[PDB]
Amino acid sequence: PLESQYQVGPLLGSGGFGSVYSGIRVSDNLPVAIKHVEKDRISDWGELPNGTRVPMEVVLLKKVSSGFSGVIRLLDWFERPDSFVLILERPEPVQDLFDFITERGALQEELARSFFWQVLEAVRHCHNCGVLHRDIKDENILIDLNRGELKLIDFGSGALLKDTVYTDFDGTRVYSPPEWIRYHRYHGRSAAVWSLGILLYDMVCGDIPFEHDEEIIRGQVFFRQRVSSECQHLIRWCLALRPSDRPTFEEIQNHPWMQDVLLPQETAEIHLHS
Amino acid sequence: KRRRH
Ligand SMILES: N[C@H]1CC[C@H](Nc2nc(Nc3cccc(C(F)(F)F)c3)c3c(=O)[nH]ccc3n2)CC1
């Protein structure tokens, strides 16, 4: 019985994903987040081991949930007449990367490096579990302010990872690659890498580089902030127009700009604690 | 501007 085992707090936000509430697990006071998804609003369905029809999001989160991660954990879920309810881990204190960037502006390279590294580890983890996120962006990342750990959220636009072409997409347009914009086709990994380049530009410049289809298609990158040459190079590499000209995760992580990353806690101590 | 999507 959903109502008895959780105590609802205030609405955290709402949007394409539905509505997310702060909550608490009554039994042990574990901070949780409670997400409501309307059935009519779910485009993509999957099925479990047992075979009953759930949101793809549930399948995906189950595939990435075992062990530890920079992926937010699914603790439980419930079906209701017209909606599904997902219980998810909630770090405390926490701020999403979008608000963090809004508040602090362009991030120091050292901080952006630590953050970007953790995103990369989390995305490799997903891929390793056969899950493609398809909506990587600052709004979909949480910062545990005490430990300096990033967590990936919102798998609601995700898919099973495959090696063949995708011809459907419902993530964020401004993070989507030119091959999507032009042809409505992309491969999972190289599209993920493009959005990672958008993300990295966002972190080091305080905003995304493209707002328009024309700019995405053109793929010319201009810097408004002082940014090192190695960082600019990594960015322009991730944003190569041809998918096969983009780096693999391995190449990204071996890039000279990615050397000497801080540990999460070091990151929180240097950049996050007051 | 610096905005949500
Ligand atoms: N503008 C908002 C819109 C709501 C969005 N959603 C959100 N926010 C979450 N946590 C959260 C908790 C307190 C405060 C915030 C904050 F400040 F909105 F970033 C986020 C969680 C979560 O802790 N676990 C799983 C999902 C989740 N989702 C975070 C950013």
Domain with CATH 1.10.510.10 in chain A: 93-274
My answer on whether omega of the bond before A55 falls inside 30° of 0, hence cis, is no
**Ligand 1 contact via A136 beta carbon (within 6 Å):** no
CATH number for region A1-92: 3.30.200.20
**Ligand 1 contact via A75 beta carbon (within 6 Å):** no
Report which of A1, A4, A6 is spatially closest to residue A87, judged by C-alpha positions: A6
Report which of A162, A12, A10, A2 is spatially closest to residue A72, judged by C-alpha positions: A12
Q: What angle do CA A22, A196, A98 make, to 5 degrees?
A: 35
Contact A252, A234 (CB under 8 A): yes
Residue A248 per-residue DSSP state? P
SS3 A199: helix
- H or E segment and range at residue A65: helix A56-65
A19 annotated as ligand-binding:
yes
The DSSP-derived string for A14-60 is EETTEEEEEEEETTTTEEEEEEEEEGGG---EEE-TT--EEEHHHHH
A4 annotated as ligand-binding:
no
Report which of B4, B2, B5, B3 is spatially closest to residue A225, judged by C-alpha positions: B2
Residue type, A18: G
The DSSP-derived string for A103-151 is HH-SPPHHHHHHHHHHHHHHHHHHHHTTEE----SGGGEEEETTTTEEE
Residue type, A157: S
SS3 A218: helix
| Shortest-distance atom of ligand 1 to CA A99 | 19
* Method in brief: X-ray
The first and second tokens of residue A73, run together, are 């954990």
**Ligand 1 contact via A90 beta carbon (within 6 Å):** yes
Q: What angle do CA A33, A37, A42 make, to 5 degrees?
A: 140
The alpha-carbon radius of gyration of chain A (Å, integer) is 19
SS3 A70: coil
Domain with CATH 3.30.200.20 in chain A: 1-92
Contact A114, A262 (CB under 8 A): yes
How far, in Å, is the centroid of ligand 1 from the Cα of A247?
Answer: 31
Report which of A80, A15, A17 is spatially closest to residue A43, judged by C-alpha positions: A17
SS3 A68: coil
Contact A147, A265 (CB under 8 A): yes
Residues A93-274: name the CATH superfamily: Transferase(Phosphotransferase) domain 1 (1.10.510.10)
Question: Residues of B with CB below 8 A from A175's CB?
Answer: 5
The first and second tokens of residue A65, run together, are 């949930």
Burial A122-155 (b: 16+ CB within 10 A, else e): bbebbbebebbbbbbbbbbbbbbbbebbbbbbbb
The first and second tokens of residue A194, run together, are 């493009």
- The angle, 0 to 180 degrees and rounded to 10, between the axes of the packed helices A188-205 and A229-238 is 150
